[PDB]
Amino acid sequence: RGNLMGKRVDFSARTVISGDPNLELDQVGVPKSIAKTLTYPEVVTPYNIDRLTQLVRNGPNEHPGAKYVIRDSGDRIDLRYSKRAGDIQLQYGWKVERHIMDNDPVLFNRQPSLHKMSMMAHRVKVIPYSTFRLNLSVTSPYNADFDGDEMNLHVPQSEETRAELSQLCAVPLQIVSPQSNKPCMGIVQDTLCGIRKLTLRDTFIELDQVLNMLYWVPDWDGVIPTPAIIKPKPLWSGKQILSVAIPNGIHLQRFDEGTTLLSPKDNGMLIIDGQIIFGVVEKKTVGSSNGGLIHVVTREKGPQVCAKLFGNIQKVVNFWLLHNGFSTGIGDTIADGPTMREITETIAEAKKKVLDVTKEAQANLLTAKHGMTLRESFEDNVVRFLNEARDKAGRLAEVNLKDLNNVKQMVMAGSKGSFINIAQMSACVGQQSVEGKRIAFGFVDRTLPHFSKDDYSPESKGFVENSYLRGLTPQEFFFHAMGGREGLIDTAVKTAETGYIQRRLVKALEDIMVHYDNTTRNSLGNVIQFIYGEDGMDAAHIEKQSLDTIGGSDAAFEK
């Protein structure tokens, strides 16, 4: 497990990574420095020798090139220091250790490998910068971030090895994952935020932008679609332009909260034959959702069409967003004056609730709930009171946000952010928690030496009334830091324990494969399951189906 079962290996590389919107999903951006380093043995056929001789002629100092020549007798030829680096006579049965070249299969890895989708094969695209370039929609299976992460890359050395990479471990094959029986890749931040603003009914695109947006799609028919609006000014909808990226023969149906077939507020999603009918596009349509658009295109059209569909959506939406623009400032965190007054009034009435329950418990008029003490019931009631307070204030803020609010736009697109972030930033961060309880009496009968002893008030036990916009008091800041320390401790402890948990799981089930009778077995031949998954089917080709026989009256079933 340190030398056997895990080794440092030849033909390996790592670098800082960054993301390229104008790369393909299966493509990896390989620097020329690395591409001039890593080699592949190519045997001299009649098909390659006219290219291999020119590669050897170029030498190991520019990227289309080679480093070593292996003769049939077995003595290596170093092209960096040799006489014969210009007058080589290639004969069949020799090997040329050529450079990495474009559209080569490589393994691509992000180092916590808790996934078969953390090492995936990739097509090489060679780029002139030192970073590994990759598509944004391949981040989530690797759990990559471009804040300084480094990624590994391995290079096959034989034809069966490249076949195993390209035909089993390729990126478009691992789109629908056996875990969660759903697509692991999807549209991510900028594309997800811009595809919503593109698909609004207000969003109309003039001819000059429509023509470039059409030409941006790689596999195009060359047919300009008929515009939506014709007479007063010929205009297109973003729904009309985006549908060129969707291949003909796609049908997607989706209904949600309020969904007529006239669908006011553009809820749901209806797509027929590579054209959408109604629906604002967002995360449930185009994200990693089960039964989503990537699920449909991967299942029906295939993996390659879906992988090209990723880039086709990305290019159009990134172009429209680049020429549209989008930002976020502190004005996106500021609610109305009346809304702030109503929010602090809500916090004040929660404070009065806490005072009244405190006095009721102090007069020994409290009713003991069965199974718990008086103080447990008191702590439970005050904690539930302050949680209701911060949630009501956050919803009071989220009502007050406009449709132009950019945090609200990122929430509505599902790109980044949630409701609790708006609550903590604009209205109230709320109540800090240590070991499941409020801020404990670290001092004798108090939390801070600025409080009198035996103070069970919200401020004393760590309720933080002010928001991140308004500013925390010193006590509030210290209690927030006291909670955040436990948060970072829990993060480190979770990682350290879960690595061992995953290792024990894998080393326990490492020998379990389906044999050639669907009997799930191990090395001994002991049967774990007689049919794999109790039905003998792959979790990749599995979707959520409704069974119309289960529900409803016997009368409607009869009808």
Binding site: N181, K507, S523, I528
Partner: protein, 160 residues
Amino acid sequence: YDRKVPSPTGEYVKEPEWVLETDGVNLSEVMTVPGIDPTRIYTNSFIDIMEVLGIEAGRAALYKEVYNVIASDGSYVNYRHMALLVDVMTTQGGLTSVTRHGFNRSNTGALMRCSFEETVEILFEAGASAELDDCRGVSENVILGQMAPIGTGAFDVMID
């Protein structure tokens, strides 16, 4: 507890019921009590369910507990993976934990077994008990640097 149950029409309807939750377990004594349903009672301690209701009810309790652990955070895993883990724990007749004295004391070769934990003691006892390894395991062929009997190596290839 809210609950859905069929109406006499057949349509499912909400029939909420009073349900007791405890703080301990001696389920062998608790189900033999009047006024409860002994066909429906359930423990979060799957090991007592294995000891009381047989090993196959321990399978379902173990799966339901792992499922609740996963679905608490909101994540989905497919049935086959958790069922594989459960059946691996349950095939040997009783609950076989995932530990150095759980699965890793089985008859599953020796070089695979020495790859997890207690490497030197396992190699010593395999040398002492005169163990033989079929090398059908993955880790045996990883150690031997051979094409393991796995997906692309489960078979031979010859000519017509």
